[PDB]
Write a protein that binds this ligand. Structure first.
Ligand SMILES: CCCCCCCCCCCCCC(=O)O
Ligand SMILES: CCCCCCCCCCCCCC(=O)O
Ligand SMILES: [Fe+3]
Ligand SMILES: [Fe+3]
Ligand SMILES: [Mn+3]
Ligand SMILES: [Mn+3]
Lengths: 289, 289
């Protein structure tokens, strides 16, 4: 439904804007899935116990379905950016979406490398909080942006996507793979993939932080939205973590500590608020363009 | 609105499917905008005549606005792929969209390198066919997919996007930059950018070809759709080319021949049909999955 082109504006694009800096970062730090050596993970995998394989398969399942979900569910944000006339942010989000596709790809390649070929949905059957987040909260909230690209809708969506799903859940998951792999010096392919996905995620989270901060600065009502949505989801995220532990008698393999993981995740969620609240009362110019 | 996850299916993803082969290709052949040396183009640029700069600025304007448009307008196709349950195609399209963003980026960097900072919309004022394609036909047709992800809607959208805008117009534009730059051995940064964008475009067009072929094979009614939409747009594309020549008295700089360019573009459009018509009557298995 088009009238003008952002790329043709006087002065061009502002390469110093956050989304364009992130885009350039993603270009400089682009990594190739074909560069990750998976040829050693199967040997480690076969040496694990049944329980250890079960746990790691279930963690992997949660990951790859989550990547897939974000790949799909990020799309309405691109639409919102277009509605706001923010080409640089739209550009950034194309990279974001591509990266999530590539995350989906690399987990799939790891699964293939370790010999996993069965339907994995069964690993989500007993994780109702997971399904509530990834099959309901995330798509429903993101999809709202198609009809309502308002600052309030953006903030709600960014909380769900960037601050909870990435900021709380994915980071806690990376910590889980850390606990599984590092001290035992196993699964070097997984380890490498997690490092690289982590690196991409740093940018995705920077974008989400930026997005909430600029709306918060512009209108303190958006702080309301932020705080409310965070407080709604933190317990649901924590329930996901709890349900996962419960399936293993709260004593999973790899010596994972339920209390450690709840503390970690809580910290990750809690630390989010401060990072946004600092935008309150700031000239939007100090935050944006 | 989610129920299952494609990434969790028995047997995983099919790495041999066309969209996944293209995705892997795009990963292997990823190019960095920061690798293109632009530091020599300004010197060449300043040696051109006013007329030559005018013509090339207008060609560049058409390009970068077109990249921007496709970056934006590809999005509804991702939605259609999701509706069809085709995760591999969705994945591919994230890469496609990212690449168009990066195309937009690199043309913007070239403009900056040559010292162009004015608002460029004025270069489109006298190109009404351009505006009709890029501001009306392309967004309207693509946007239809949001509400109607049917095979017929997909085919119409793919004709507009892949077969006309890329297949006919962009290819003719690459030929224009070839005529401008190669024999004179100028603008090595432009030349390099055009080669790299060309390489990405080969994949985008492969995807569009695949998409039309699989719907055509599945139902010959989709051949109707294809043929009709092509025949509707070819004259509009040719009018775009004509209007561009007319502004320069049908004798632009760089010794460009109107008749040569009309023949080239016509050939590019015409050659499209055969590539799709061969899918008629074929088992879809010979074309897809
Ligand atoms: C004890 C560990 C429980 C950790 C929870 C695992 C859930 C994985 C969430 C995946 C989200 C991916 C989102 C993204 O890539 O941006
Ligand atoms: C005599 C030359 C006239 C050529 C027409 C120039 C129009 C440029 C179209 C740009 C389309 C970009 C689409 C894409 O990148 O996929
Ligand atoms: Fe992410
Ligand atoms: Fe393209
Ligand atoms: Mn990810
Ligand atoms: Mn392009």
């Amino acid at each position: 439904t088009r009238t003008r082109s952002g790329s043709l504006a006087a002065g061009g694009l502002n390469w110093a804007s956050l989304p364009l800096k992130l885009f350039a970062g993603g270009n400089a730090k682009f990594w190739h899935p074909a560069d990750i050596d998976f040829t050693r993970d199967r040997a480690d995998w076969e040496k694990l116990s049944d329980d250890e394989r079960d746990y790691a398969t279930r963690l992997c399942t949660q990951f790859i379905a989550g990547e897939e979900a974000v790949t799909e569910d990020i799309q309405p944000f691109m639409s919102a950016m277009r509605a706001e006339g923010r080409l640089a942010d739209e550009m950034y989000l194309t990279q974001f979406a591509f990266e999530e596709a590539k995350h989906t790809q690399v987990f799939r390649m790891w699964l293939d490398a370790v010999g996993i070929s069965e339907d994995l949905h069964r690993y989500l059957d007993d994780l109702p909080a997971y399904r509530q987040i990834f099959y309901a909260e995330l798509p429903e909230c993101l999809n709202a942006l198609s009809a309502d690209p308002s600052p309030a809708a953006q903030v709600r969506a960014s909380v769900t996507y960037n601050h909870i799903v990435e900021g709380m859940l994915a980071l806690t998951g990376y910590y889980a793979w850390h606990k599984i792999c590092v001290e035992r010096a196993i699964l070097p392919g997984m380890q490498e993939l997690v490092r690289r996905i982590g690196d991409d995620e740093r940018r995705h989270m920077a974008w989400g932080t930026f997005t909430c901060r600029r709306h918060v600065a512009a209108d303190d009502a958006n702080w309301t939205v932020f705080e409310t949505r965070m407080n709604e989801l933190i317990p649901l995220a924590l329930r996901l973590i709890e349900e996962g532990f419960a399936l293993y008698g709260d004593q999973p393999p790899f010596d994972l500590s339920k209390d450690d993981f709840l503390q970690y995740s809580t910290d990750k969620g809690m630390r989010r608020f401060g990072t946004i609240s600092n935008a309150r009362g700031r000239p939007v110019a100090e935050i944006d363009v």
